[PDB]
Amino acid sequence: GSMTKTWTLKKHFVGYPTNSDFELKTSELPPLKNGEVLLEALFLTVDPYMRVAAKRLKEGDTMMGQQVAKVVESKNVALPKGTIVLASPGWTTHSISDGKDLEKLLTEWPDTIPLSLALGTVGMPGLTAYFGLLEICGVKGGETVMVNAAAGAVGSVVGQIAKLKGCKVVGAVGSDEKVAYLQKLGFDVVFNYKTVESLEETLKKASPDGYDCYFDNVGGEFSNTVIGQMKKFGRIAICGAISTYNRTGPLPPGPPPEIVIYQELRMEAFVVYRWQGDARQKALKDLLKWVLEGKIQYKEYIIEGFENMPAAFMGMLKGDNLGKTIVKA
Amino acid sequence: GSMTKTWTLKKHFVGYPTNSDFELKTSELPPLKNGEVLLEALFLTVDPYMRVAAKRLKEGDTMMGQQVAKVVESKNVALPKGTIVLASPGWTTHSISDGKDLEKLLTEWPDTIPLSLALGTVGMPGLTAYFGLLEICGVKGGETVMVNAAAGAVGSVVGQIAKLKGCKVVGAVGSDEKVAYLQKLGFDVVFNYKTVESLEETLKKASPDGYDCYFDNVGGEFSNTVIGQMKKFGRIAICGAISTYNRTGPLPPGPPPEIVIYQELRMEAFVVYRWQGDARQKALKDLLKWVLEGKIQYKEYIIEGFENMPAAFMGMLKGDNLGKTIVKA
Amino acid sequence: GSMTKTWTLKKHFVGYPTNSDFELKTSELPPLKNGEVLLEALFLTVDPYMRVAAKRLKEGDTMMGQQVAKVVESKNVALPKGTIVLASPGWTTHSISDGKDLEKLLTEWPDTIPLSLALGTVGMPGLTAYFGLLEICGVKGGETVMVNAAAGAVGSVVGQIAKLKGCKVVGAVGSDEKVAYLQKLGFDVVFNYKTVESLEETLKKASPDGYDCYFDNVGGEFSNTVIGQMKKFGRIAICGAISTYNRTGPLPPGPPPEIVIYQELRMEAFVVYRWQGDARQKALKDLLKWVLEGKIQYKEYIIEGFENMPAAFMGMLKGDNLGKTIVKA
Amino acid sequence: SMTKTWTLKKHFVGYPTNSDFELKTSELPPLKNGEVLLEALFLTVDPYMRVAAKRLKEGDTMMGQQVAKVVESKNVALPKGTIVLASPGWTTHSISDGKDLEKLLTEWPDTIPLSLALGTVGMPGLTAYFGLLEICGVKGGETVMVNAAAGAVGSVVGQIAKLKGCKVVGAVGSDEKVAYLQKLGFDVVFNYKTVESLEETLKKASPDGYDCYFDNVGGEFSNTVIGQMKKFGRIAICGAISTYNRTGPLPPGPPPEIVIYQELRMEAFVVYRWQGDARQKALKDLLKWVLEGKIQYKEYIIEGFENMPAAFMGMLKGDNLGKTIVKA
C-alpha cells in the first residue's frame, strides 16, 4: 500500500559513473507482515566503495548503501513509530525490515549533533579512521603521519585523531579550499597535490626526516612517491585506492621493489567491519566524545533531495565534497 | 708480493648481464704489515641482490660478494695460518684483512658438511628463509604457504622449514627437474610456472581454499596472480622481486588494490641482516642442527673456477641453479 | 549591454571529463567598438582534440571550439546583421569579433542542407578525412583501406570518399547500431571492436591480402594489430589516437618494430590546417558537391541546448554519437 | 672436403649466450656440374640475426653473409681464386651452384680490405646511404640525430651527413666511442648510458630540435627523440636494437599528441628494397667516398671462426667500434 523510490544501476560504469548509468524507479512495497516495520530514509550515504562493489551488481539492481531512517509504520512492539535506526536497504526512500538487520544509535547519542554523523565521523568512515590509524598504523604520539584525501570523511578524522594524539600531520587534498580548511583545523602541513610543482619535493620539505606512518586512501603513483620517503620500518595502513576505482586501463606500476625492501616497510590493509563488539562500541564512544569536546570538528557536504543521489555519488568521486558526503532525504 | 685476480663491473647491466659487462683484472697486493693476514678464497657466492646493487657501483669497481676463505700468510697471531673465515672483499681470489670484518664459522661446524654451506643453507640465504617464514610470515603450523623460486637457495629452505612446521607447501619452479626434486623432498604441490597453461588455474587447483602465507621471491605479474588467491588476513613476506631485476622498461602493473584491501592482507618486506646477536646465532645453530639431522636437505649448484664466476652469476639469474649457486675456487 | 553564457574549465580532466570539471558563467559583454560585430551562436561543435588541448588551459579559461554564428549587431559594413560566419570564440553563446578571424561559408552554400555541416562533413572534420585519405594515404583506387571510428565525423567521411574512389573499406566502430548503419551505407566490412572474439582474426578475414592504407583515429593496441596486417609498403595516416586521450596511466606498448621494419611501413601524421588557399577551397567544394549528389550521406548527433554542451562533449568521447556531434544553441 | 658450422642449439632468452650455439664439423659432398667450393675469408655478424633466429628451428645453421674465395671449381665462370659474396650462414666452407653469388665491384682496389664489402661498401653502408638520403631525404644543412652512431650503419650515416653539410648529434655507449666520433668531426657526441637525463642532453645538444632522425635503437630512446623533432621532421626507422633482446613487453609507444602536432613523417625500410641501378649507384658512391677520405673506415676484427658466437654477442652489447667482422 506504500510507495517507494529506488535508484538502480541501469548500465555498468565505464570510467566515472554518469547520469545515464542510473535509473530511478517508483514501486509499491508489499504490505507489512507481523513483526515488520516501514522505514523512511532521513539521510543516505554515498561512499567510494560503491564504485567498486557496483561491478558485481546486475543491471536493474538497487545501489547498495546505508541510511539513517525512522519507523513510520510499525507492527513490532519493540520498534514504535519514531524510532531512529541505521539500515542498509540501498538507495531507496522507503523499505521493509523485520528488525533483525537494524542497528540503533548509541544510547548516549545527543541532539546537539546531526543524526547524519552516524554515517560519517561517528559512523563507518570515522571507525575506519579510528582503527586504521590507532591500530593498523599504531600511532603512539610524536610520529609524522602522511594522510591523503585529508579533507574527506576518513582522512579528515585521521588527521584530527593524529593531532590530538600528539602527532605531526601532513595532508594532501585536491583543492585550495580544502587546504585552507585543514590549515584552520591545525594540520601541520597541507598542500594541493594537483598543483604542486613536484610531489616528491613537497613531501620531502613537509618532513625532511621521513614519515613514520602513511594512512593511504588514494593509491597509485601518489603512493609510490610516499613510499620513497617512509622512514625505515615505516607503517602503511592500506585503507583505500580511490585513484584506481574509475580506471579504464592497466594499473600503474608498483613501487620499485628496491625501495620497499631497503625500507623494510610493514604494509597492512584492513576493512572497518573487522572490529565488532566492545572494540567497535568503544571507538564510537571515543569519536562521539571527541566531537562534543571539539577535538574533532565535523563538516558535512550535504546534497538535498533523493533525486540528486547519483549526482552526489559522482561529485564525491571527483572531490566536490568537503567532509562526509550526505544526501538529505 | 702476492698476486690476485678480481672481477670488476666494466659496464652497467642492460637487461640480463653478459660476459662483456665484466672484466678480469690481475694486480699485485702489497706485502703484509703488522696485524694483517692474506686470505685465499675457497668458495665464493653469487646472489640475486648483486644484479640490483651493481647499479650503485661505478664502472671499474669490484663486484660485491661474500666468500669462505683461509689464512695462507699471517702477521697476526690471533688469525693463524689455516683459519677459516667469512669475508666480503668482492669477487677476488686473494685479499688482505686485519680481522675486524671477519666472521668465524660456528664452533661446532663439522667436517661432514661442505664449508660452502656457510654461504647458503647455514648462511645468509638460510637465515633469510628462517626469519622470513617464521617471523614475517609468522607461521604457527598448518598454514598453506606459496613459495616461488622454490628450488633456489632461500626458497628451498623456506619450503622445508614450512614442512617440518606442519604447513602445506605449494612451490613454483622453472624446470621439470626442479619440479621432480622438490616433489621428492615432500612439497605438497610443485609445478613449473613456465609451462603450465594458466598460472591462475594451477594455483587454484593446488589450493582451492587459498593461501595463508606467501613467501615472495619473484614479484611482478606472478605475485599479482598469487594475490588474487590469498586468504583473508593472509601474510606476505616480501623477500625479493627477481622478475624485475633484469628489466629494461617500466615495472609491471601492481596488484589490484581491490583484492588487497578486501582480503585485508598483511605485507612486510625485510632484510636478513635485521636480525643480529643471539637471535642470529640461535637461527644459525637451528639451521645447522636441521642439516645434520636430515630435516633440511641441502643441494649445491657448484661451478668450478674463479674465471667462471660471471657465468655462475648469469646462469643463476637464468634459473640454471638447483640449490645455492657456489663458485669453487 | 549584451549578456552571454560561457562554459569554462573549472578543473583539469582526470580520466574522462565529468560535469564537475565545467562551470557555466554569465557575463556582460562590453559595447561594440567601430569595426566590431556581435555574434550569436547557432551551432557549436565539440571535438576530441578538446580533451587534449584543455591540458594547456588555466582553470577558469573558456573551453576552445568553433561555431556557426549570425551577426546580431554590426559596426562593420562587410558583416551586416544576419550574416552567417564560422568563428572560434570558444564555448560561448555571444561574442565580439573584429571580423579578421571570421570565415564566411562557401558562397554557393544552399538552404537545402543544415548550416551545421560547416562544422562537419563540409567543414573541419570533412577536410581531415579529405586530405588524410587522398593525400597522406594517397589512395588512387582499388586499395583496401582500414578506418577506425568509422561512424564518427572523420571516419565516416573517410569510408565514403574511399568507396566513391573505388576502394574496399573495412571499418571499426564501437556499437552494433554503428555496424548496421555503415553496412547499409555500403562499407564492405564493418565490425564492433569491443565484442570481437579476436581482433586479429577479424581483420584477417576482412582482408586476407592485407591493408594498403590505414586511416588511424584510435591508436593504442588496436593499431598494433592493424600494423600486423598492413601490406608491405602500406601507408598509415596518423590522424588521431583517441584511445589515449582519457588515459590515467602510461601509454600502451608500441607496435612490434620487427613488423614495422620488415613491412617497410610509411607513417605520416598531419593536421587538417596544413592545407590552405586554393587547395582548401577545392576540398570544401568537393565535399559539398558530393553531399548534394548523395555520394556522401550526412548524419548528425544533435544535442539541443547550450547548457548541455559539456554532456555532448562527454558523450562523444564515450561513443554516443553517430556522425558529427553538434550542439544546437 | 670438411666444413665447420655454427648452429642454433637453443632459442635465445634475452641476449644470446655461449651455450645457445653448437659447433658441428661435417664432410661436404663432392662437386657436381656448375658447383664450387667456397672458403670463407670474412664473415659478418649483424643485429638482425638476433631476430631472424626466432624463425629458425633448433639445430639449424645461423644465417649470415660472408666474403669467400673459390678453392675448387667445376664452373668455368667461377675459377679458383674468385672473390664472391655468399650467404651460406655461419660456415667455414660451403657448396654453391653459382646462382646466388655476387661479384664485388669491378673497380674494387687492393688498397682497401676485402672485409669492407660486408660493411661500409656493403649492406650496412647501403643501409646508411638509402636510409639517410631517401627516407630522411637529407639535402644538406639539416640537424640529424643518429644513435648507435659508432656502429657500422650509424658511423656511415653521420659521415655522409657531415659531407652533405649537416649538423650531426650522435649517441654512443662508451667514452671511447665518444672520443672517436668527436675526432671524426661530429658536431655533438654523448654517451647515452651516463647522461642523467636523455631529454636534457638532447635539448641542449640542439635547442632548435631535430630535422631528421636516423633510428637504430627504438624503444624509450626514440620516445625522447620524438619529443624534440621539428615540425614536418623525418624519421628513418632503420632498426630497434634496444628491443631485440627483450624478455617482457615492449615499452610504451611514442606520445601520439606530439607525433600529430609535429606532423612527423616516419618510414621504415629494408636495404634490399633498392636493387639494380639504384643499388649499383650507391655502391659506387660509397667506394668513392672511402677512397676520398670523406668516409673513414674502422673495423672491429675478431680473429677465429670459433669466436663467431662471441663476436655476435659482443656486438649486441656494444663492444664493437665500427663494423664487426670475423676473420676466418
Ligand SMILES: NC(=O)c1ccc[n+]([C@@H]2O[C@H](COP(=O)([O-])OP(=O)(O)OC[C@H]3O[C@@H](n4cnc5c(N)ncnc54)[C@H](OP(=O)(O)O)[C@@H]3O)[C@@H](O)[C@H]2O)c1
Ligand atoms: N578500508 C575500509 O574499510 C574503508 C572504509 C571507508 C573508506 N575507505 C576508503 O577510504 C577512502 C576515503 O573514503 P571516504 O568515504 O572518506 O571518501 P572521501 O574522501 O570523503 O571522498 C573521496 C575523496 O577522494 C579524493 N579523490 C578522488 N579521486 C582522487 C584521485 N584520483 N586522487 C586523489 N584523491 C582523489 C577526493 O578528494 P581530493 O579533492 O582530496 O582529491 C574526494 O573528496 C576511499 O578510498 C575509500 O574506499 C576504506
Ligand SMILES: NC(=O)c1ccc[n+]([C@@H]2O[C@H](COP(=O)([O-])OP(=O)(O)OC[C@H]3O[C@@H](n4cnc5c(N)ncnc54)[C@H](OP(=O)(O)O)[C@@H]3O)[C@@H](O)[C@H]2O)c1
Ligand atoms: N631480503 C633479503 O634479505 C634477501 C636475502 C637474500 C635473497 N633475497 C631474495 O630472495 C630471492 C632468492 O635469492 P637466492 O639467493 O635464493 O637465489 P636463487 O633462487 O638460488 O636463484 C634465483 C632464482 O630465481 C628464479 N628466477 C629468475 N628469474 C625469474 C623470473 N623472472 N621469474 C621467476 N623466477 C625467476 C630462478 O629459478 P626458477 O627456475 O624458479 O625461475 C633462479 O634459480 C631473490 O629475489 C633475492 O633477491 C632476499
Ligand SMILES: NC(=O)c1ccc[n+]([C@@H]2O[C@H](COP(=O)([O-])OP(=O)(O)OC[C@H]3O[C@@H](n4cnc5c(N)ncnc54)[C@H](OP(=O)(O)O)[C@@H]3O)[C@@H](O)[C@H]2O)c1
Ligand atoms: N589531425 C587532425 O587534423 C584531426 C582533425 C579532426 C579530428 N582528428 C582526430 O580524428 C578522430 C576523430 O575525430 P571526430 O571529430 O571525427 O570524432 P568522432 O569520431 O565523431 O567521435 C569520437 C569517436 O571515437 C570513438 N572512440 C572513443 N573512445 C574510443 C576508444 N577508446 N577506442 C576507440 N574508439 C573510441 C567513438 O566511436 P566508437 O563507437 O567507434 O568508439 C566516438 O564516437 C579523433 O582521434 C580526432 O582527434 C584529427
Ligand SMILES: NC(=O)c1ccc[n+]([C@@H]2O[C@H](COP(=O)([O-])OP(=O)(O)OC[C@H]3O[C@@H](n4cnc5c(N)ncnc54)[C@H](OP(=O)(O)O)[C@@H]3O)[C@@H](O)[C@H]2O)c1
Ligand atoms: N635494412 C635495415 O633496416 C637494416 C640493415 C642493417 C642494420 N639495421 C639496424 O641498424 C642497427 C645497427 O646495425 P649495425 O649492423 O650497424 O650494428 P652496430 O651498430 O655495428 O652494432 C649494434 C650497436 O647497437 C648499440 N646497442 C646495443 N644495445 C643497445 C641499446 N639497448 N640501446 C642502444 N644502443 C644499443 C651498440 O652500440 P652503443 O655502444 O652505441 O650502444 C652496438 O655497437 C640495428 O638496429 C640493425 O638491426 C637495419
Ligand SMILES: COc1ccc2c(c1)c(CC(=O)O)c(C)n2C(=O)c1ccc(Cl)cc1
Ligand atoms: C631489491 O634489490 C636489492 C638491492 C640491494 C640489496 C637487496 C636487494 C638485498 C636483499 C636481497 O634481495 O637479497 C640486499 C641484502 N641488498 C644489498 O645491497 C646489501 C648487501 C649486503 C649488505 Cl650487508 C646489506 C645490503
Ligand SMILES: COc1ccc2c(c1)c(CC(=O)O)c(C)n2C(=O)c1ccc(Cl)cc1
Ligand atoms: C577497493 O576495493 C574494495 C571493494 C569492495 C569493498 C571495499 C573495497 C570496501 C572498503 C572501502 O574501500 O570503503 C568495502 C566496505 N567493500 C565492500 O564491498 C562492502 C560493501 C558493503 C559492506 Cl556492508 C561490506 C563490504
Ligand SMILES: COc1ccc2c(c1)c(CC(=O)O)c(C)n2C(=O)c1ccc(Cl)cc1
Ligand atoms: C628487427 O627485426 C628484423 C627481422 C628481420 C630482418 C631485419 C630486422 C632486417 C634489417 C636489420 O634490422 O638489420 C633485415 C634485413 N631482416 C631480414 O629478415 C632480411 C634478411 C634477408 C633479406 Cl634479403 C631481407 C631481409
Ligand SMILES: COc1ccc2c(c1)c(CC(=O)O)c(C)n2C(=O)c1ccc(Cl)cc1
Ligand atoms: C591529441 O593531441 C592534440 C592536441 C591538440 C590538437 C590536436 C591533437 C588536433 C588534431 C586532432 O583533432 O587530432 C588539433 C587541431 N589540435 C589543436 O590544438 C588545434 C589547433 C588549432 C586549431 Cl584552429 C584548433 C585546434
